[PDB]
Design a protein around this ligand. Structure first.
Ligand SMILES: [Zn+2]
Ligand SMILES: [Zn+2]
Lengths: 183, 183
């Protein structure tokens, strides 16, 4: 009853993902080159798409491959108009959390990868007000590869939706000692 | 046979406090003016010091007063040599948490008040590497008044202990889109 993609996205720790269309995945032009990064590609793919498979312990490995593949597909997908739209809905809901920087007054953030290359760095969060990047406060997010979001995504969303760019901070930090402005 | 001060500091949410010496509290010169900011001062003070008191349910109010008074005493105490020493121990233990800013590579932080006036702002956390201020990630800390730490404390500690000042971040965030440094 439940689709693999629906299932995966609803797992704990996977709150930053949206659901990629089957349409997108089914167009091989979108998947160029992934078959060189993922073991068991053909099966990982069948799995993502709820197709029928081929009794090993092994199949656990296809699940891991399935997860990596979905991740890499995801980073490409959220650069498309549909992808952006779904993530924007998430953004509006604060799904990605809020900037911890006092003078950003709780600006909602977006997920981002420091690298497009898997295994380099876990997913981070970008604040468009201070335009810097933060480690997610919740540890359920510390094992999600940032390559499944990519370096470009936030910039891409604000380009398509300039109306969501916040204004510069009204105020900033002013260090004080015994009443005096120091430094 | 647990002291009031020991009890308070061990309460959940009070992890950023250290234990003020009785010696300090018993020198009235240290408490100048606090009697004008706190209701039920005399009793709040007796309570802090584990002396004895006398609708005797009211007393709940003396406990609230006692907590405010200790808080205000604390903000004066942590600017002294003994105070700083205790907070440094805490700092070294990461009791106050770590900077969420990716490129600060988990610099440990210090508590800080944006105002020395009670009721203005809840306690914040100061990172000495990026020299900006953050909201504590944990909500158990969102009802602690920053006036119990004050604006001066961090600056004061690094003045007494310059050897703890971190170096500037090696790196910083470099926005990229499809490989390109964008600007
Ligand atoms: Zn920010
Ligand atoms: Zn920092």
């Amino acid at each position: 009853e439940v689709s693999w993609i629906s299932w995966f996205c609803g797992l704990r720790g996977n709150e930053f993902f949206c659901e990629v269309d089957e349409d997108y995945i089914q167009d091989k032009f979108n998947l160029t080159g992934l078959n060189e990064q993922v073991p068991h590609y053909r099966q990982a793919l069948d799995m993502i798409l709820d197709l029928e498979p081929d009794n090993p312990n092994q199949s656990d490995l296809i699940e891991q491959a399935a997860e990596m593949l979905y991740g890499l597909i995801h980073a490409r997908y959220i650069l498309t108009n549909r992808g952006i739209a779904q993530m924007l809905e998430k953004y509006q809901q604060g799904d990605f959390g809020y900037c911890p920087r006092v003078y950003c007054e709780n600006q909602p953030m977006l997920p981002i990868g420091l690298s497009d290359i898997p295994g380099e760095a876990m997913v981070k969060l970008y604040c468009p007000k201070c335009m810097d990047v933060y480690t997610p406060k919740s540890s359920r997010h510390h094992h999600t590869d940032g390559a499944y979001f990519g370096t470009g995504f936030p910039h891409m969303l604000f380009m398509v939706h300039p109306e969501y760019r916040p204004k510069r901070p009204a105020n900033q930090f002013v260090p004080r000692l015994y009443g005096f402005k120091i430094h």
